[PDB]
Amino acid sequence: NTIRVIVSVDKAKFNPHEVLGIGGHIVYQFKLIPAVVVDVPANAVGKLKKMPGVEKVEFDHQAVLLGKPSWLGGGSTQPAQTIPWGIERVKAPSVWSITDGSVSVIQVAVLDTGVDYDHPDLAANIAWCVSTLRGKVSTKLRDCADQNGHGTHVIGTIAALNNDIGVVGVAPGVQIYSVRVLDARGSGSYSDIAIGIEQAILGPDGVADKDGDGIIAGDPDDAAAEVISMSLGGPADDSYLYDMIIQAYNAGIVIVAASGNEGAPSPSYPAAYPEVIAVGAIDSNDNIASFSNRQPEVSAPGVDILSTYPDDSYETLMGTAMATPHVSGVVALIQAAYYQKYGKILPVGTFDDISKNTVRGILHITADDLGPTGWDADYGYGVVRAALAVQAALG
Ligand SMILES: [Ca+2]
Ligand SMILES: [Ca+2]
Ligand SMILES: [Ca+2]
Ligand SMILES: [Ca+2]
Ligand SMILES: [Ca+2]
Ligand SMILES: [Ca+2]
Known part of the structure; x- marks a missing residue:
């Protein structure tokens, strides 16, 4: 009708x-x-x-969450902080005394099924909580809350708090914009995703460039997120979505998305865009996941990933959805460290970049080159490493 x-x-x-x-x-x-x-x-x-x-x-096309419950099962096993293997694999913990993301100009936006916003191991890092479901930008906590669990997981992978309890993220001090673009079932229309991308450059004030100087991401006077991380994809490439993606990129925002779980020969969209870093999944043996769609940009822990889960709980999931937030969290550290030292963030790379001069080039060079030497179709440039990346950014 x-x-x-x-x-x-x-x-x-x-x-x-x-x-x-x-x-x-x-x-x-x-x-x-x-x-x-x-x-x-x-x-x-x-x-x-x-x-x-x-x-x-x-x-209006359909995109879908890219993470699923793992074969090995299970929860936070102890009443103390667990460090999930993947956090240690991407060499995050040794960065934290330099930064843990807590540089205040830095936000990561996560477009997903929502967040369990008062999760004791998330709450402090959640700076903005929006839904875009059905075309209506809502900022009601009841609308912005995770009905699925996935976005809660993905967010705790980036940003769970370093403390007493639960887990810890790659960047446990970075501020999170949770932008609910997928419904309770983990389905999302491209339109809602495009809007989410817009909400992530606007930030909480509804204005892209308040103060008019053409600096968006990395601008203390603007609320724009510096990372947009999408643990989702679909088969359609529409030009208004790609245009929105070019808006983010042009704002100087790094865009990160899941390659897909179909064992396909290339990434889904939006991962497949040049302006997005497509992320594939490894397991705890440094084998590529067989589900992981091929020809990613980098790869990251994506199998048996323990993380935050509603309600105030933790669960183990798998997918290129779980790999993605490791990359995003590794960018957040790069940019935070970079800003903390210089007055400024780095530029987003290109896919080709092997310079020490952009986020993407530094990623590509400091990655742990598994399989066949150089970029390969399983690993991309290889498994991302926060410690080595941050050393490059500041060297
Ligand atoms: Ca914790
Ligand atoms: Ca500005
Ligand atoms: Ca300014
Ligand atoms: Ca910002
Ligand atoms: Ca809760
Ligand atoms: Ca390789």
């Missing part, structure tokens, strides 16, 4: 009453790209096409 559709518009010519006229609804007018999410009856899609200036009509 009604269908959701994302129109790419001439914002000069385009009038939302026109769609309202044809029985439609306006879902979300993008702040950062000339586009608008709409509901139209099926027959109107014709009409919608040359509304002035509707220049492109794109359908």
